[PDB]
Write a protein that binds this ligand. Structure first.
Ligand SMILES: NC(=O)c1ccc[n+]([C@@H]2O[C@H](COP(=O)([O-])OP(=O)(O)OC[C@H]3O[C@@H](n4cnc5c(N)ncnc54)[C@H](O)[C@@H]3O)[C@@H](O)[C@H]2O)c1
Ligand SMILES: NC(=O)c1ccc[n+]([C@@H]2O[C@H](COP(=O)([O-])OP(=O)(O)OC[C@H]3O[C@@H](n4cnc5c(N)ncnc54)[C@H](O)[C@@H]3O)[C@@H](O)[C@H]2O)c1
Ligand SMILES: CCCCCCCC=O
Ligand SMILES: CCCCCCCC=O
Lengths: 485, 485
C-alpha cells in the first residue's frame, strides 16, 4: 500500500552545488522499512572528500546568497513552503516508509509541523531589523557563514526544516547530513528546494555515517558553525571535534521530561492526554513527558487510568489510516527500548501494563508494546535514562515542593508539563522547572516558542526568531555616527 | 615607590562561601614584578578539591541569590561599583605591580573601564524584562546557575568585571580563577565584593594553574556554564573538557585586528593614533589593531609616520607618572614576543624601527622595544599570528576591494579599524570586515557595545545587555494563558 518510490537516479547521489553528483566512494547504505524489516532502498555513504566538495560549494555560494536581499530570500523560502504543501502526501509516504510513522501521523503532523518552520522563517524576514542604531554605534546582524547540519530520524523532515529554514533565511549557506536511518525524505526535500529555485550551493546534501561524514563536518576548517540534533553521545563528540576551529556549536540532545499533575487537576481528564503525550511518535521524541509525577494518594487511580488509555492505542501497520502507533523506527532502537523495559522489570518497578516482546499479531516489524511502570523511584535506571520508546514512568509525591524536586531531579531539561486547575499555581510551578519549555494543561504546539534544553539537553534554541538568531553573528560599528565637539 | 602591600593573612587563602579559607594543598605560586623581575608575593595553588569546595558554596548560595529581586541585586552591584571607585588607587597600584601597567595607564583606564562594566550591569536591571507575554506563551529569562570564570593577566580587573558583574546581575553564582600571573588585584577585588555586601557563596575565588584549577572547573558536573578569556590553546581545551557535561561555553580568544586606512584618510593625523592603538598596554591586548592596511603609493609616508610616533613613546618605570609603556607583563610573554620579532626579521620583513633586545637603559625588567615592520606579506608569520606585544605590521594594497580581502585574510575576527574621510564609504567597508567590532576614525570606548569574536576569536558576547544575556537561560511557558473556544 505505501506508495513511495525512491528515485533510482538520485538514490545514491549527493546534492552538491545545484546538481546530483556521484559519491567519491562506492559504499552503500541499505534502508530498512521498520514495519516489515525489508531493505527498501540504498543510498550512498559519503567520505571526507565528499564533505569537502559540499563545503566548497557552500563557501562559493555564500557571497551571492548573503548578498541577496531579505525580501528576495523570503520569496525563495516562501516557494519552498508552497512545494512542501503541494508534495505533502509524497513526503508523508516516504517518512512512514523509512521510520515507520503511522501514515495518519505523517500527514497530520510529521509534514505540517515541518511546513510551519519554513512559514515562520519566511514571515520573519518581513520585520527583522538587521541593523540598529543606538547613537554613534550601530549593531548589524550578519549570517555566520557555512553551516553543518546533522539531524536524527524520529521527526526527519521536521528536524531538517527547523535548521535549514532559519539558516537559509539568515543568509547562511548549508551542508546537511540527514540520519542514515531516514534518508529517503531528505532525498525528496533536496529535490524540493531545487525545484523551489534555491541557488546552487546554498543547500547541500550528503549521506553517510555520523562518525565519518558528521566527523568530517565537525572538524572542517571552512565550516563556521555546526548544529546537531541527536544523542548526547554524538552531541559531545561533535563539540569536541569542533573545539579547535572554535565553531559555533548548537545542540539539541536528550530529555526526560516530567509531567506534574498538581493535586487540583482533573485526574480522569488529565492522565489520558499525558499518556498519549508520552507515547506520541511511539515515544520516539526527546521532549516527550515520560515521567508522570502525581500525588501518592492518587497513584492507584492514575495507574488504572494509564493502563486504560494505553490499552486502547491501536498499534499496527502504518499503511492503515486507523493505525495510531507504528513500529519502533529501526532494529537498533527496538533492541535498546527492549533492554530498558527489561531493566525496569529487573530493578523492581511495577509493570502496570505493556512489557517486553513484539506486539502480538505483528511479529514481523519492530512493533513494541506501550509500557507503563509505576511505584517508580527516581534512582531507577528507567527514571534517569531516556528510553526513546513508549515507556511511561509513574512517580509519587507527598508535597508540591517534593514534586518540583523530582521534576528537576535529572541531568536533562528539554521540556516539561504541568496539569492544574488553579492557573496561578500552575504558572508558579512552571517557572520552577529548569527546562526550556513548560506546557500548561496541554496547550497546542507553538512554532514561535523557543525550543531547547537547560543543563544537558543542549545549547542554543530553535524555532521562531530565537532559532533564526542562532545563525547570525553580532557586529558593533562604534563611531558609526561621529560624536559631539 | 609602588605602594601596594599584599594582605599577608589572605595572600595564600581562597575566598569561598563568604570567608577566606586555607587551601587544601600547600603549593604556592610566586608573583613576579615584571619591572624588576623580583618575586613580590606568593599566592596559593588550588587543587580539584578546592574547586569542589567553591562549586559547593556557589551551588548552595544559588537559590537565595537568584531568589533575590532584581532591584535588590542591583543595590549590591551598585555598592560594589562605589567601592571600586573608592579603592581605585589601591587597585591601580596592584595591577601595575603584578603585570607592569604604567601607573598612569592603571589609573586612567585599567580601573575606570572595569568600573564601567559594573555600572552598566547595575543600570541594566532597572529596565530588563525577565518575563514577556506573546499571547498564551510567556518567555521567562532565568539565571543559568553556577558559572566558572577564567580570566587573563593583561586587563586583569577589567576582565574580571566583564564576567562577574553581568553574571551576578543575572542571578548567577560564580567561581573565578584569576590569572596566576595577575592574582594580586583579584585578591583586592574579592575583599571588595565582601565589603560591598555580597551574600556568602555568590562569588568565590580560587587561585592556581589553568590546567589544574581551570581543568577541574571545565569538567565539573555541577557547573552549568564556563566563560574563559584567554588563548586559543586554552579556549579549545576548556571547550573539549566541558563537552561531556554540555555546559554553556563562552570564549574570548585571540585576534589580529586590521586597521584599514582608506585612500581619502588624513594620513598624517591617522597613522599616529593607529600606532598608539596598536601599542596600547604595550601591545598586550587581543583587539589591538596590529595590522595597518594602507595604499601602496602611501606606504613610505606611513612608514615614516609610524617610526616617528613609535620613537616618541616613553618606555620605562611604571612607577613614574610620565611613563607611557611599562614592561611586557611577565618573563614567558617577554620571550614569546622576542621570538616573534626575530621571526619577522628572518622572514624578510622590513624593520622600520624597534627590534629585539631589552630597551636600552632598562636592562632589568621585561622592557620590550616598540617594533614596526613594513613591506609585510599576509603569508608571513608576524602577519598571521597574534604576538601580544608592541609589534605593528604595515601591509600595502592596490584597491579598496583588496584591502578588505587582506583584512579578512585571517583565522581571527575580534575587532577591526577603519580610517576614512567619506563616512558613507567607511561604513560600507566596516560592514564588510568579519569582526565583532569595527571602529571608525578612532571612536571612544563604548561599554554597551557587544564585544566578541567572529570565526576563531571566540563564541558569545560580553559587555552591556548582550553580555548579560550570556548568563540567562530561555524558557517558554506555552499555555501560559489558555486559548479560545
Ligand atoms: N532536542 C531536540 O529538539 C531533539 C529533537 C529530536 C530528537 N532529539 C534526540 O535525538 C535522539 C534520537 O536520535 P538518535 O539517538 O538516533 O541520534 P544519534 O545521536 O545517534 O544521531 C544523530 C545524528 O548524528 C549523527 N552522528 C552519529 N554519531 C556521530 C558522530 N560521532 N559525529 C557526528 N555525527 C554523528 C547521526 O548520523 C545522526 O545524523 C534522542 O535522544 C532524541 O531525544 C532531540
Ligand atoms: N577576546 C577578548 O575579550 C580578550 C580580552 C583579553 C585578552 N584576550 C586574549 O588572552 C590572551 C592573553 O592571555 P594568555 O595568553 O596569558 O592566556 P592563556 O590562554 O594562557 O590563559 C588564560 C586563562 O586560562 C587559564 N588556563 C591556562 N590553561 C588552561 C587550561 N588548559 N584549562 C583551563 N584554564 C587554563 C590560565 O590560568 C588563565 O587564567 C591573548 O590571546 C589575548 O588576546 C582576549
Ligand atoms: C506536538 C509535538 C511536536 C513534535 C515535537 C518533536 C520534538 C522532540 O523531539
Ligand atoms: C580602549 C581599549 C579598552 C580595552 C580593551 C581590552 C580588550 C582586549 O583585550
Amino acid at each position: 500500500l505505501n506508495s513511495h518510490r525512491v528515485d533510482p537516479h538520485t538514490a545514491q547521489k549527493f546534492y552538491i552545488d545545484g546538481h546530483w553528483s556521484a559519491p567519491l566512494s562506492p559504499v552503500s547504505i541499505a534502508v530498512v522499512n521498520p514495519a516489515t524489516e525489508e531493505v527498501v532502498a540504498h543510498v550512498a555513504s559519503g567520505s571526507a572528500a565528499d564533505v569537502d566538495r559540499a563545503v566548497a560549494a557552500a563557501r562559493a555560494a555564500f557571497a551571492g546568497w548573503s548578498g541577496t536581499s531579505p525580501e528576495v530570500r523570503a520569496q525563495v523560502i516562501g516557494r519552498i513552503h508552497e512545494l512542501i504543501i503541494e508534495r505533502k502526501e509524497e513526503l508523508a509516504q516516504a517518512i512512514s516508509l523509512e521510520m515507520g510513522a503511522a501514515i495518519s501521523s505523517a500527514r497530520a503532523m510529521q509534514v505540517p509541523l515541518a511546513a510551519e518552520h519554513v512559514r515562520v522563517a519566511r514571515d520573519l524576514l518581513a520585520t527583522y531589523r538587521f541593523q540598529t542604531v543606538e547613537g554613534g554605534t550601530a549593531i548589524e546582524r550578519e549570517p555566520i557563514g557555512v553551516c553543518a547540519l546533522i539531524t536524527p530520524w524520529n521527526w526527519p523532515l521536521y528536524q531538517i526544516t527547523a535548521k535549514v529554514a532559519p539558516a537559509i533565511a539568515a543568509g547562511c549557506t548549508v551542508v546537511l547530513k540527514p540520519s542514515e536511518l531516514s534518508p529517503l525524505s531528505a532525498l525528496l526535500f533536496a529535490q524540493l528546494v531545487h525545484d523551489a529555485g534555491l541557488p546552487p550551493g546554498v543547500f547541500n546534501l550528503v549521506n553517510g555515517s555520523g562518525p565519518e561524514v558528521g566527523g568530517a563536518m565537525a572538524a572542517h576548517p571552512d565550516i563556521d558553525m555546526i548544529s546537531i540534533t541527536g544523542s548526547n553521545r554524538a552531541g559531545a563528540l561533535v563539540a569536541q571535534a569542533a573545539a579547535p576551529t572554535v565553531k559555533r556549536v548548537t545542540q539539541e540532545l536528550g530529555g526526560k521530561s516530567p509531567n506534574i499533575l498538581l493535586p487540583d487537576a482533573d485526574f480522569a481528564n488529565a492522565v489520558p492526554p499525558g499518556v498519549m503525550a508520552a507515547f506520541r511518535n511511539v515515544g520516539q521524541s526527546a521532549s516527550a513527558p515520560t515521567r508522570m509525577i502525581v500525588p501518592r494518594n492518587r497513584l492507584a487511580e492514575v495507574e488504572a487510568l494509564a493502563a486504560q488509555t494505553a490499552g486502547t492505542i491501536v498499534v499496527g501497520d502504518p499503511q492503515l489510516e486507523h493505525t495510531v502507533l507504528g513500529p519502533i523506527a529501526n532494529e537498533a532502537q527496538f533492541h535498546r527500548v527492549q533492554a530498558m523495559i527489561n531493566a525496569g522489570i529487573c530493578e523492581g518497578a511495577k509493570l502496570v501494563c505493556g512489557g517486553p516482546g513484539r506486539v502480538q499479531g505483528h511479529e514481523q516489524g519492530f512493533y513494541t508494546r506501550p509500557t507503563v511502570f509505576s511505584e517508580v523511584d527516581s534512582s531507577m535506571r528507567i527514571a534517569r535514562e531516556e528510553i526513546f520508546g513508549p515507556v511511561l514512568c509513574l512517580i509519587a509525591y507527598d508535597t508540591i515542593d517534593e514534586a518540583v524536586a523530582i521534576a528537576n531531579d535529572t541531568v536533562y531539561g528539554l521540556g516539561a508539563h504541568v496539569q492544574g486547575q488553579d492557573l496561578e499555581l500552575a504558572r508558579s510551578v512552571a517557572s520552577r522547572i529548569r527546562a526550556g519549555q513548560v506546557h500548561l494543561n496541554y496547550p497546542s504546539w507553538n512554532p514561535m516558542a523557543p525550543f531547547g534544553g537547560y543543563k544537558r539537553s543542549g545549547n542554543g534554541r530553535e524555532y521562531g526568531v530565537h532559532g533564526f538568531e542562532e545563525y547570525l553573528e553580532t557586529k558593533a560599528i562604534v563611531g558609526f555616527a561621529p560624536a559631539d565637539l
